[model samples]
Target chain A: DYIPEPMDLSLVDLPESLIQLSERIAENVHEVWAKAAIDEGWTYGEKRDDIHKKHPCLVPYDELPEEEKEYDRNTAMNTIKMVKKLGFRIEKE
Target chain B: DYIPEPMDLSLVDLPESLIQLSERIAENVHEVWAKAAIDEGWTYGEKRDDIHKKHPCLVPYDELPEEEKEYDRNTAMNTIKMVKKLGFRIEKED
Candidate 1:
């Protein structure tokens, strides 16, 4: 299935504008992570070679199915949590 | 004091363009994290009330000191690591 619908970010006390920035950050990181993984031979449990039919390893993030993109999105959210521990704010661009 | 210098991400195996995207991703998440902390009263051990002079909680991420921006940058980098564990690739913009 597609990445579980992204968390309802509105729950946090932040301006609508700030949320947009965070969303993009998560997305960008996902692409970067995937590229690195492909270069580094990383995988999530089932490697494309080990699996049957699907050739995820051969495709880019944009072309990959939503289920795969979810992995990057999840990572982005977890990262946001870590920075919150240090205390910062999302200002205007 | 400012956050430590960001790690030279070039050490990883990725295209020049891909690295750039990853860098921005880290940067954006930091802002999101900071705003949330301010709202939740979550501090990194030393609360602003306990500390003297500096007022990080009061300003926006852009206005915050570079020492502070470093904080978000670090988080974004860490997030990149997590995703690498999974598999994906940055592609041309739509």
Candidate 2:
């Protein structure tokens, strides 16, 4: 699934119903993207470009190191992937 | 990537030296696990047990409902074919 806040929304300014509807719409859109991706060969996991570049390897979850299991990927790894995709390097050592 | 707080110990009181040492050790352990796991093809992402149970469709990320995109998965979807061997059951809304 995608982040609940499609593009950093302002829920406080919105009415409850509007907020709910907005979230629903966002989620529906997310599901649509997710389903289509799944049908092909997309997957959920952590693999930033930098990391992928440094690690020079992107494997399936079952293929990742046991240590990789500690930090959040689907949620946590997104930030890592975002930066890496931009060619930013992670010095998390 | 897994969480750094393995056991959730109070790091606040830890000395800088000790803390650094501890962190280093932990990272080393994690890397070992990662390298070994990579040999097998494991990845880092959400594990949809309940989602799979209720939804139980396991469609590719591209095929998933738009709403599902909010939470994020991998950079995309981890196909059902690959996930099954991992011992997790995922599904699509449809």
Candidate 3:
């Protein structure tokens, strides 16, 4: 069986700016994912139904439950962390 | 307009072991993505046809074009870099 060994990022601290940016990125991630799903004939439903292309997350990012939102948050944070780890800094030009 | 200010990872150098692992992870990433697409009724095709649920990337990872494989390689490298940045070390168990 395949085993997954993920990084432990619990000790990595983010500044206030990155924390704020993380939320923004998380919202955008949800938006992008939802838009792609919609373009693929998906629609809003109470639960995820692949057969019908219905997903509860088709709604706005702000309307998502905390649990669902956490998924996007994790993605955003990890991306930011990865960028920083790669010796690249995110700044406005 | 929302402008993307991405991090410049050009300076970061990965060790040989991590570089090898990155390739392994890249292959696995392609496998997982292909498997998921297949489970969702997608199939192999010469081109991506959304209406028909066909994609050109359904082939084995070794058969993928360099440009396509680079995407997965990038993901794998970034993930490994992030782990190291977070002060985590990857090793095999006895």
Task: Give DockQ for candidates 1 onward, in order.
Answer: 0.05, 0.02, 0.06
Winner on TM-score between 1 and 2 is 1
- Per-residue lDDT tens digits for candidate 3, residues B37-77, read 78788888896677898888888787889977876676556
Lowest-scoring 10 consecutive residues by lDDT in candidate 1 chain A? A1-10
A1-93: candidate 3 lDDT, tens digit per residue: 222233444665555545655555566555555655677788888966668877777777778899767766665565444434434433332
Which candidate comes out best when scored by lDDT? 3
* Cα error of candidate 3 at position B21, Å: 13
Worst 10 residues of 2 chain A by lDDT: A3-12
Best by DockQ: 3
Q: Which candidate model has the greater DockQ, 1 or 2?
A: 1
What's the TM for chain B in candidate 1?
0.48
| TM-score of the A-chain for all models | 0.48, 0.32, 0.84
lDDT for model 1 comes to: 0.44
Which digits, one per residue and each the tens of the lDDT, describe model 2 over residues B1-94?
4111111112213223322233223232233334444345444334423322222223333444555433243222221112222232222211
**What are the Cα lDDT values of the candidates?**
0.44, 0.30, 0.60
User: What's the TM-score of every candidate structure?
Assistant: 0.35, 0.20, 0.50
TM-score of 2: 0.20
